[PDB]
Design a protein around this ligand. Structure first.
Ligand SMILES: *[C@@H]1O[C@H](CO)[C@@H](O[C@@H]2O[C@H](CO)[C@@H](O)[C@H](O)[C@H]2NC(C)=O)[C@H](O)[C@H]1NC(C)=O
Ligand SMILES: *[C@@H]1O[C@H](CO)[C@@H](O[C@@H]2O[C@H](CO)[C@@H](O)[C@H](O)[C@H]2NC(C)=O)[C@H](O)[C@H]1NC(C)=O
Ligand SMILES: *[C@@H]1O[C@H](CO)[C@@H](O[C@@H]2O[C@H](CO)[C@@H](O)[C@H](O)[C@H]2NC(C)=O)[C@H](O)[C@H]1NC(C)=O
Ligand SMILES: *[C@@H]1O[C@H](CO)[C@@H](O[C@@H]2O[C@H](CO)[C@@H](O)[C@H](O)[C@H]2NC(C)=O)[C@H](O)[C@H]1NC(C)=O
Ligand SMILES: *[C@@H]1O[C@H](CO)[C@@H](O)[C@H](O)[C@H]1NC(C)=O
Ligand SMILES: *[C@@H]1O[C@H](CO)[C@@H](O)[C@H](O)[C@H]1NC(C)=O
Ligand SMILES: *[C@@H]1O[C@H](CO)[C@@H](O)[C@H](O)[C@H]1NC(C)=O
Ligand SMILES: *[C@@H]1O[C@H](CO)[C@@H](O)[C@H](O)[C@H]1NC(C)=O
Lengths: 49, 50, 99, 50, 198
């Protein structure tokens, strides 16, 4: 309440508070099951475009 | 249509004539007033950050 | 302010996001024309009504309350005397009954 | 698609040409996981409005 | 007059739709305000010819039957005293900014989309409502609003309102001519106050 109201003293009543309590700690990445590399080399080294 | 301005009737005026009712009807009429609307609130983090 | 006619009561009832009133009103009907006078000059002095109006059916005068037609004989308790009748405009001639 | 939140299991059905869904077009309600074809709906991490 | 509009509409006209809804709500609110202030009792009583009002002169506040317009004398001076847009804006916009109700559409394109909607009630209808209220009050006392036709002489209505303020009927009936002269002089003073460009 002190952080949302930007004051060190709050008055009597009800107050709605924004989320300051939870922070993420771990990260997950989910990508498709792709194994083979792209033929970027084959395209790039081509003898004639 | 043009708006009906009201009930059209006429009254006869004289300097020594009075109209006094001899009967009465007790009529009960309804009338509706609003009091309050929907009590709403917004969550700032879900609104902005999501 | 609380219904067409003279207000007697209102009964509140709850409503979604509101309130409804049941206004009980007094609505008169069945009017009748009557010949009226502002006062009555009897014995050289004017008599004014304490409550209601002076009306006449045919050639006989009575005092009645304004909203309802209740004929009452003109009586000295119903009237009060103030001055003579030469100043009142439109005063008629009649007698007042004393019990 | 990167973000911060908590995901639950969803009963929605996705068309084969659809991978990302929006109910209200400002946030992605549900995603189809690339490895397992189940559909997981994403909700914001902090919610309930304390 | 942009060469692309539907993209601009689909990206930023919804704010204007919401704000136009707000303006339409304000307009309907204003019309209902005029309704609730002038149409409390929806009964039209024709103004009687001026006969036997006890010496009181109501010829000014009542509409004149000679004029085809139903405005009375006092409200005519009220209409003439208020000039719509008596500033430089009548030179800038050619009096189209006020609700003259005869404005052209060149004024609407002058304002670049801003328009003035005419009010729901014509000023003639407001004059008719005011005439009905005046005639009903003067003829029937307070029984106008209850709903009836209870005619009563104006002397007895003065007497019962004197009983309302706490004075007996005798004070009225001995001093009827003096009260009538004072009321007529007060009405004349209001007439001279409005007519002297004050
Ligand atoms: C005043 O009006 C009421 C009705 O509004 C009259 O009551 C009726 O009286 C007759 C005969 O007594 C009955 O047959 C009806 O059933 C009554 N109607 C109702 C609704 O009660 C009453 O008689 C009238 N009074 C006068 C003096 O005319
Ligand atoms: C005015 O109405 C009153 C009240 O009904 C009449 O007074 C009575 O009338 C009856 C019938 O005519 C008589 O038998 C009584 O003797 C009357 N009483 C009194 C105290 O006068 C009165 O007659 C009516 N007036 C007219 C002109 O018809
Ligand atoms: C009421 O009665 C009185 C007398 O009791 C009337 O007064 C007389 O009226 C006649 C005609 O107008 C005159 O010739 C007399 O000189 C008057 N006498 C007095 C003493 O004033 C009076 O006119 C009557 N009023 C009404 C309205 O009938
Ligand atoms: C009420 O007052 C108006 C004026 O305020 C009177 O109208 C005048 O009438 C006289 C003749 O009676 C004319 O010479 C004037 O020109 C009128 N003046 C106006 C402004 O119209 C009217 O007569 C009065 N009514 C009564 C019953 O006395
Ligand atoms: C180009 O690179 C590809 C690998 O991506 C290889 O197979 C191919 O032989 C290369 N060609 C030349 C001309 O270097
Ligand atoms: C009273 O008299 C007027 C005119 O004389 C008439 O129009 C009206 O109908 C009368 N009222 C009754 C109840 O007879
Ligand atoms: C009512 O008016 C008539 C005609 O104008 C008149 O003769 C009579 O004296 C008046 N009565 C009162 C009480 O004013
Ligand atoms: C993707 O590969 C991993 C590793 O072999 C396997 O465990 C998983 O089942 C695969 N997902 C599929 C085939 O949908």
């Amino acid at each position: 309440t002190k952080c949302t109201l930007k004051s060190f003293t709050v008055e009597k009543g009800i107050y709605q508070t924004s989320n300051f309590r939870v922070q993420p700690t771990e990260s997950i990445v989910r990508f498709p099951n792709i194994t083979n590399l792209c033929p970027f080399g084959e395209v790039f080294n081509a003898t004639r475009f | 249509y043009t708006m009906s301005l009201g009930a059209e009737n006429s009254v006869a005026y004289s300097n020594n004539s009075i109209a006094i009712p001899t009967n009465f009807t007790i009529s009960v009429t309804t009338e509706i007033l609003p009091v309050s609307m929907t009590k709403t609130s917004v969550d700032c983090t879900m609104y902005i950050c999501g | 302010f609380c219904g067409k006619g003279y207000h007697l009561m209102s009964f509140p009832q709850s409503a979604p996001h509101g309130v409804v009133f049941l206004h009980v009103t007094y609505v008169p009907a069945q009017e009748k024309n009557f010949t009226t006078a502002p006062a009555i000059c009897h014995d050289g002095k004017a008599h004014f009504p304490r409550e209601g109006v002076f009306v006449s059916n045919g050639t006989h005068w009575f005092v009645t309350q304004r909203n309802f037609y209740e004929p009452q004989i003109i009586t000295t308790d119903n009237t009060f005397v103030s001055g003579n009748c030469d100043v009142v405009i439109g005063i008629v001639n009649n007698t007042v009954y004393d019990p | 698609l990167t973000g911060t939140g908590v995901l639950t299991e969803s009963n929605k059905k996705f068309l084969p040409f659809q991978q990302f869904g929006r109910d209200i077009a400002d946030t992605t309600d549900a995603v189809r996981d690339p490895q397992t074809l189940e559909i997981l709906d994403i909700t914001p991490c902090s919610f309930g409005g304390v | 007059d942009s060469t692309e509009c539907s993209n601009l509409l689909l990206q930023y006209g919804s704010f204007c739709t919401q704000l136009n809804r707000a303006l339409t709500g304000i307009a309907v609110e204003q019309d209902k305000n005029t309704q609730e202030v002038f149409a409390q009792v929806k009964q039209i009583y024709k103004t009687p010819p001026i006969k036997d009002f006890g010496g009181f002169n109501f010829s000014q506040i009542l509409p004149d039957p000679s004029k085809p317009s139903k405005r009375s004398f006092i409200e005519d001076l009220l209409f003439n005293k208020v000039t719509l847009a008596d500033a430089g804006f009548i030179k800038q916009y050619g009096d189209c900014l006020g609700d003259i109700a005869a404005r052209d559409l060149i004024c609407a394109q002058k304002f670049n989309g801003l328009t003035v909607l005419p009010p729901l009630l014509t000023d003639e209808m407001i004059a008719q409502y005011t005439s009905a209220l005046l005639a009903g009050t003067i003829t029937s006392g307070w029984t106008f609003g209850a709903g009836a036709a209870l005619q009563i002489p104006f002397a007895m209505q003065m007497a019962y309102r004197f009983n309302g303020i706490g004075v007996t009927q005798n004070v009225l009936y001995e001093n009827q001519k003096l009260i009538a002269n004072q009321f007529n002089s007060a009405i004349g003073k209001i007439q001279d106050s409005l007519s002297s460009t004050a």
